[PDB]
Structure formats: structure tokens, C-alpha cells
Amino acid sequence: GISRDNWHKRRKTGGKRKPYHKKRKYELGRPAANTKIGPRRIHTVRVRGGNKKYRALRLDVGNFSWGSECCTRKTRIIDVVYNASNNELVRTKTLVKNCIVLIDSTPYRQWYESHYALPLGRKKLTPEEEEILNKKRSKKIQKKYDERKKNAKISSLLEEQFQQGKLLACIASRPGQCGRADGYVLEGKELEFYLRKIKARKG
Amino acid sequence: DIQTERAYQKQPTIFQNKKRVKLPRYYKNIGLGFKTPKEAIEGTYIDKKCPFTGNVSIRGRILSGVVTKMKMQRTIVIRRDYLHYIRKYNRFEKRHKNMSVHLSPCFRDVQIGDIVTVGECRPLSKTVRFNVLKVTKAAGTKK
Amino acid sequence: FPMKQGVLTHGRVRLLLSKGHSCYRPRRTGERKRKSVRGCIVDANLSVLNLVIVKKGEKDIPGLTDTTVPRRLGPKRASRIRKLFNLSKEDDVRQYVVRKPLNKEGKKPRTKAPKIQRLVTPRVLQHKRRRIALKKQRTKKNKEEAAEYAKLLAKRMKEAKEKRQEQIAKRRRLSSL
């Protein structure tokens, strides 16, 4: 069927190479996974050596890491906004390695609230939220959260994404072979690089 | 300047997003008594296939050649010259092989006709299996 | 050509059957073979119709319901014997196992009983004890070697300590002199 072989194409000089053996089993390819966004569906493929690979066909959740604070939470994927390889792969919503996607802010917003005790985003304050931000707190731990206030300032670019309700992430795992949609949250210079690319693309 | 491609360009190891109130860069010595060029350390380029800054390891044979063409981008072609002995006539016979070599952009001043030292590596592309490890200017050609 | 469920057509068709399919018995492992099969719906072009009675009528039929044939074999797994006779967890099943009668010409009448399987026996408990016993030995061995290495490692780390102190002290001596 599909072959990943070097004997079927031209030599360095440009001369045609005539094969000496037919297609081999170990020189095989398989159809692309083309992982979409939707309810979870993985098929397993038995591969060489008897091992397993996981074809993620539809995949909706995946855990992403906030590097600046080392907070890795499981998050739901919203949309695919940018892909460096092909503009056709963002018109369709397919997840491949190193494609810029949208993930919701809620798991990270909860962590920041319970770890710094500041409101981020949040342009009424519901009873569960107001109490964690104003709970009866002894002094011995008050200074603990007070010295944690010094580095509680996050990047400006991340702030308006938090009040919008969704972040920009980059997938690092290979979902068509691992079966996962893992990645990290964009920030810093890498964030402004992909923001102007998304902006100028719209025009 | 550096970000001239569609995807963000960065070294995979350096985490550039530490919270603060110059980018540190990854580099290594490749061994075998080869000195890492200075502009690979204070430079700002990136390269997957640079021996001193990418994830390629030097193994196998260490060869040498003379530069012939520099028209491809971050890869050149050198020419190896040697003699081939033929037993019937007891004479030699000049033969040549020219080969594709990945030139890292740290070796920034390279012209046609100088001697470069190339070390075998992982197959980088269809016809490239070697990186440049050092460059020696030809006779004269200093001015 | 046999009829098989699911074809849902009128005549004969060729299908690529495999292991687990009806009307095919593979020879090698993973072998598949095309065979002709007849459709699921019944028509006039066939020889036999296999019919099974799922509910009896009001009057006895001669060839079927008059004669009665028993099950040839009795239960063999320990749990199924309990289910047949509705036994508890404590009374033994070796007493209640159904025993086959053997009677043929020229031989002495005897009776035969199947070996019962999945039965709790003094043998299996001894095996269970042995499995746990090796767990004792394996965890004991790990602690001893860790502790034995730990103090030996200190001694080898100790000699490296003074070896560093003795060279700097003489280098203090060399700098002093």
C-alpha cells in the first residue's frame, strides 16, 4: 500500500532508479488520523513489534501547562485559530502538533484565586468566590499570602485573555499517534508573535 | 530579524518566560578537541542542525574538503579529491567526489575555495549527512 | 449452501468470512476465505428448513414430545454444581457430584465421576501460601541490601572526605612553606 521508501525516487544526479525488490512490510505507511474536535474517540493500531499506537480521531479535552507558574490543569479545547503549516488545516478544525488553539480560562482562574487571593479578569461576586477571597484568615498564614502578593502580577497580554474567558495554547504532543492533546499556554514574546499573525491574517 | 518564518523560532530547551518583577541560549561542545566558535555563543541565530547549538551529535568519520558552491541556504557543497591506484599499470588516477554539507551560520565568513573539516552525523536530509566543524582559509585570501 | 443470519437478501452471495463467523472453520490462524452462502429470507429454492419449537401446543406429538432424552453430561465446575442443587458455601460438593453409571457387556458394572474443577483444596491453599511467602522474602531482601549498601557507601564516601582534606591540608602546607 503506502510506502515510506527511498528506492522509488530519483538519485542525486537525477537518474531513474530501477527497483530490485518489491514492496516490503516494514516500509509501510498508514492513513492520516486527522484529529477533529469533538466527543472523544480513539482507535488503537497494532504496530511493528506488537506495540500499540492510539489514533485520536475526535478529541475535546487535554491538559496544558502554565509555565510561568507551573500549573498544569486539564482543560477543554475550544477552537483552532492558527496553524503554521497549512491554512486549510484551520478552516477545518484539526489538531496536529504545534497548532495554536483556544482553551478555557476556568481551571487556571480557579488556581490563581486560591493561590494568590487576587481577582484576575473579572470586569457581582458570587458567594463561593467572595468567601475564598475574604475568608476568616489567621495572621500566621495572612503574611504567607501577603508575601505571595509580590509576584502575583501577571503579563498584561494574558490579562485581557483571562477576562475574555479563553487562552491561547500550543499543542506539543502528537495527537495522531499518542492519543493526547497535551501542550502549554502561550506567553511572552511567543504570544505577541502569534497575536500579530492572527490579527494580520484577518485583515 | 530572526522570526522570519511562519512558526515561532526558538531553541527547544530554553524556557524564555520566567517571571521578572538577554535570552540565555543553549550550546554545547561537540568533543574530539573541536573548539566551539565564539559567535555560536554570543550569536542570536537558531538552528536545529547546527552542531554547537542543535540536537545533532558528531560520530563516525571526520573528513575534509574544499568549498565549491554556496548557493543553497544553510548548506554548501564541498569537493573531495583523491587518487585511485590501478594495479595493471602501477599508476594512479585522479578521482573526485563532491558532497552536500550543512553549514551552520556561525561559520559566517566562508568563501569559495577554502578547506573545511566535516564530521559525520545523523542523516539531516536526502543527501546531507555531514556538518562543518571548522573552516581554514585558503592560501593568501586574507585581504 | 447454508443460510446465515444478517445477509438479508434473496439468493446466494459470496462473502469473505473469518474467525468467529458462521459456516466457516478456519485452518490456519488469521486465515480468511470467500464462500457462497444463501440469503437470510426463505423462499421456495432450498432443501431443508431448520425449525425449532419454542412453545408447545395442547396435544402430544408422537415423534418429538413422547420420547425424552436426558442431558448426557453433568456439571463439572464446582460453582455450577452448587447452582444445580442450591448448596451453600460450607457444605462440600464432593458429596453431591453426579456420578455416571457404566454398564456394558463382558465387564464389571462400575460408576464414573468427573474431576471437579475450581475446587478449594488443601493443595491450592499451599500454593497461595507460597505466593505470599515469596513476597515476604522479596521485600526482606530489598531492605537488607539497601541498608548494607547504605553503610558501605558511607565508608567509601568517608575515605573520599579525608582524601580531599589531606590534599588541601598539604596544599595548605605547600602554600605555607
Place this chain on the structure above:
Amino acid sequence: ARGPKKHLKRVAAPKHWMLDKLTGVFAPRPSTGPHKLRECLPLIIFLRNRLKYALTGDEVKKICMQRFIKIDGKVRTDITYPAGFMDVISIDKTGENFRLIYDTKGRFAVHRITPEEAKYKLCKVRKIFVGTKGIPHLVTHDARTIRYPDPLIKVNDTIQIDLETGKITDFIKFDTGNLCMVTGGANLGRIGVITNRERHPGSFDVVHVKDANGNSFATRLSNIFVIGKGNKPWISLPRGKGIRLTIAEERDKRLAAKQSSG
């Protein structure tokens, strides 16, 4: 081909087995084990061709399947089990012990040893390796894995293992001066004291070594197997003491022994 091979022609067998030509077409292919195919010695060859306890392939099968043969302290019922350097063959019923040691030529010589010498063996380490929880490991030349070794054991050292417990008793550090035995190459079977260690980064290091007669010979480091401090072996050496006598004086002692024997 389409899978792993399972036969071995006689004329393609290793030369030191000393197999002949006209007995058969096939040679006993060593079973997979701790020693490489070309540097091992199958149990079939040792009992039928060397000791001559048997005559045919079936006779030795009866010998080893009565659990008479114990290799390195364990009973082996494989007629083609590969036994290699320094392995201790122990046939308890006849009261006899062996240790596979190269003689002055390229061959494994039969070497009867005392029962006290048969309780241990020496082995070269190949790897130093840290386990899952900081647990040190080392790998010997015959594929033994043993945990928590002495931290002073390095990659080219040799250790003395007690075959009953498989634990280290003492070790010899690889350094100049120590006695050596060459396990491979053109010089294998020779014995001498290590003289120099010349290292090539990337290539194979060479070891210069001279025997008791002052002859000097080199070899690659992968063929060096230290067998003692200074010039005292930790094992009993075979006849010839690992001194290779050239062809000139080999006949000189061959006939002079003959005219001494008559």
C-alpha cells in the same frame, strides 16, 4: 532473510571448535544465552568432542537430561547451551570440575580445577548503570546484573563472584601493572602484564602488554580481561602459562620431548 536463522553449517562454524568436514552438513547452532555465538562453546561440543564421554548427539542428550551437568552452579538441560570464557563446568557425579580458559592458541582447553576454585569465577564488567531509585547496577561480560556494588568499581574492572550467592567478593581495578588475558583478536590466549593505555577519542583504545618473556604485543581494549594483581593470577592458569611459543622452537620442544620419551 524473512526471519531469524536457526541452522549452522559446519564449514561456517567457528574454527576453534575444531569441527571436521565429512561427519555432517550441519553444526550445532549455540542457543541464545549469555555468550556470543562466535566466542562460546556449546555443551554438545564439550562432552562429545573434547571429553569424549559420548559418541553421538543422542548419547550426550541422555547425559545432560539426567541432570548430571551443572554449569556455573546451575543445572542445564540444553545440549546446545553456550558456555563461554571463565564458566565453571561441574559434573558432580564423576567428581570433576572444569573452567573454560583459552590455551596458548585460539582454543578452549580442558582445565581441571579443584572444588574450592570451582566455587567462584571472575568476570569483566561492561556497564555502570543507575536503577530506578538511585540503585546502582553493573553488567558483567556474561550478562549478569547485580545491584548495590562497591562504588569503586568502574567500567573495565573485573570482579570475583561467588557462584552460590552471585555477589561480589573482591575486585581488580584496571590499571597498568596488573596481569591480563586476551579474550579475542590475533593474540587471544596470551598472558602478560599491562604496560600502557593509549586512548583514541571516538575510536577504540589500544592496550600494550608484554608477557613473561619480554615479547610485547598490543590489542584493542575490548579484548582485555584482567586476571590478577601484579603478576599473580587469581585463577589457576593452564599449561604453557599463556606464553605463545613460535613455530621455530615449538618443533624444537616437540621432538626433544619425543626423543626424551623415546
Place this chain on the structure above:
RNA sequence: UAACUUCGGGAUAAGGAUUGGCUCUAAGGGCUGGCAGCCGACUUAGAACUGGUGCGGACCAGGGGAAUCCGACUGUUUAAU
């Protein structure tokens, strides 16, 4: 894309494929103060979907090839055979 050739031709040689609708994508420029803002005009290429395979849907719009005879060719000629 051939024979042949006065090397200019033969030539639209001969012989094949595609062509709708809809929704998109990319490239191609000005003015003002390697950037930013404000303006645009038509084209080309590619992709997905989709119709009873239907698309230069009417109109417009070269049948072709192999040879022989004569006149080189363009041009002119018996208004009414």
C-alpha cells in the same frame, strides 16, 4: 505535437483532460506620518461542499489524415452561363 522543409514554417498538426453553483484562502497597489493609519481597483492560482455526469448548457464557434497533377506565393480576369 510527426513526415518534410527554402530552417522562416508545417501548427489550432495529429491526440488527450478540464469547464456549473456556492463558501472560502493566497498573491498581485496608492496616499499620509523593514512601522502605523486610511484607502482602494480589478485579475490569477488553490481548496471544501454540492446538483438525476450536469456545465463554452442559448448565441458565437476549424472535421481530420496519407498521396498524385498544375500554378511558387499575395494579386487580376470573361458586368448577365
Place this chain on the structure above:
RNA sequence: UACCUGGUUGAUCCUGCCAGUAGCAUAUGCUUGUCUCAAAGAUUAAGCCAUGCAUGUCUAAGUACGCACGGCCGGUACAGUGAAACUGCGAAUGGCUCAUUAAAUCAGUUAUGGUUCCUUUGGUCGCUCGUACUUGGAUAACUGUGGUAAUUCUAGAGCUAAUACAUGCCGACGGGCGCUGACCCCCUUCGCGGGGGGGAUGCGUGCAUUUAUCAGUGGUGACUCUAGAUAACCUCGGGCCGAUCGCACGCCCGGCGGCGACGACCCAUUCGAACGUCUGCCCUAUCAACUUUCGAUGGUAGUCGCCGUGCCUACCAUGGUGACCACGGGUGACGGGGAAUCAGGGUUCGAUUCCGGAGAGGGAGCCUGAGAAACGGCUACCACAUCCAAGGAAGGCAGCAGGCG
């Protein structure tokens, strides 16, 4: 043993070839007492095949309620042989042939710090903090009813097993270690404040997988190596943590016991395999330019693959090879270790028993499996060909013999 002789002329000395001369294969003719070795349908047809055989397999140790044999001691299941069938493994080795194949194969040399690896050997296998004195329902073998002209074709009914297929806990297990932390206590301070302790509850708490961050046990010439810490994840087409078997048979006050068999995740090992590095091949110029939006040479990001890589996709750049013979063609071309002839050089041969490649009439596509693009496995199409009730079924000798050509 570094070798010559006849033949152009009326005669001579040359050039020069023709013919003699000696081996070595292939065939053929005539002849043929003994004995030891010994090649043998390669050359033309990798043309076509009747018939028979060439791959099966049980130990004390997976599943015996086939009186098929068989002991008596019964009734506490199974004495013990044991056909059959389920299960496991093997069938990817060997054997045959040389059609394809000209930097391809192959050879010597090196790399995998860029990967898979059944089996063997050695390690790991209460590290995990959460009906077990043993859980479930099917199915062969068997009994019985059948179909077809026909096959190693199978249907419906009745039973019954597992080391087949599934489900699944107790113990170690009593706690530690990280986060929270209600609270409490102590010291200093007028006091806020500052410092030091103990601390309920609750969450996590093994290895393997995937991602991100931090620090820098052991090793390398050189790691983005091995190990460590943190935050999470962990596929229902779920990953391991034993619901298996045999010999003996004892010790305590029902509980403990030895030696094995089998099976399992991972790491090493072995046998390898697969991609690469460098150098090396016959004739031909009446083959001088070749390759490229139908990948040609590179870049970036990915997809696929066991991994590296235009392997493939998208966007880019215009590259790459050649008179030092590229590209194209031919080969009566499988390569090599080798064979014949030989002064010193060489010339010719290598289908042929050892190593490596390829292929099973020609192509193509797959299943199972650690390993196959397998053909004494399957599915198509082409050619050829077999039985037939005319509805259908079956096929692959370049295996051993044997037959036609």
C-alpha cells in the same frame, strides 16, 4: 622448463598473418579387466505438469465423566494408560533456482548519542495507602437430526471444561511523605508587629505513558543521557501489580511450611533485523548535456512510520549532476570468498554445495504473528489448466522422484 616449426620468392632478408603445439571445460565417436573418491536438466524454456511424498508437536507438571482399555478399597471429585478436540508453540528455518538487478546488489570499514527484537541468561515482580477457602457464561470434543453430484464444505438441536474468553478483592497497611490548614502553645515587643514550635480535617501519595517546569547520583570524546524534585495526565479499540499446575509431605497452636512448572510489565543480554558512512564494477558517444510546480536540490512547520530523512503534505528559495565520462542504452550481468591458464606482468570464467540478495506462472492487495507484503497462507485481475448432474467446486514441483517439451 622465461621455447617454437611449416607456408608468399628462381633464390635472399624482412613485415605479416594463416596452420601447426600444450592445457582446461561442454558435447560427441570408438573402446573399456580391478579398486578409491566423485560432478550430474545451469546454458535453449523463471516452459507446462499426471501420481505419491516433503511440518508437525505431550511432560510428574493447561483442559479426560470417549468402560477405548483398565485396579479395587469404595463412594472423600479425580487410580492409571489413553484416541479425539479445545489450548500453547512451530510452520518467517531448511530446500530449489538465477528471471530481475550496473553505486543497485555485494565486499572491506564504521555508526544507530537516530530504532524494533519471540526465545535464552541475569535482574526486577507486599515500593501503590485503595466471594478471595476461588467469581461469570459460552464453546468444541461427544450424543442426535441433516443438505449438496461433488471439497480437509458445513447447518439446526442437546450437554460439559481451561494456563481459551471475561470480571475482580482481601493482605503488606501501621503508618510515613508532600500540600492545605481550623487551632493551640511559647519567646520578644505597651501594642501593632517580629520569631519559634506542635497541630485535627481534607487532597495527593508505586512503576510504565504524555506534557510542562526546577536543580545539577553516575557516565561519555561529545546528550536534550541515567538518576532527582514539582504540577498534572493516564485512551472503554483501558498497562503491570499471579482467581493457573506437579511432586513430595512436615512443623506449630486452624495457622505456617520446601523444591519446582507455567505466565507476566520493565531494564540489560543473546540471536538478529533495518536504515545510514567511506572506497571499490563490464561494454558503448552512430548516447553530450540531464533532473524540476507528476520532488528535481535545499529551508521551516508538520503528517506517516519502529525510529533519522522530500517518506509525504503546506509555504518558500533555485537549486543538484557532467568530459575526472553525468544521463541514456546493452549485457549470452545475481555479487563475493573463489576457478583455469600461467616465467615477471596478465587474460578469461564464477548458474554451481560457503556468505549476502532476489523469486515462487505474471502483477497487485492483505490476515495472523516478535518476525511475512509468506505463496507446501488468504483476496482479486491476466494466462494456462482440472472435476461437474451445467447449478458450482478446486489450482500453482525455480522441493524429492517422475513425465511432456
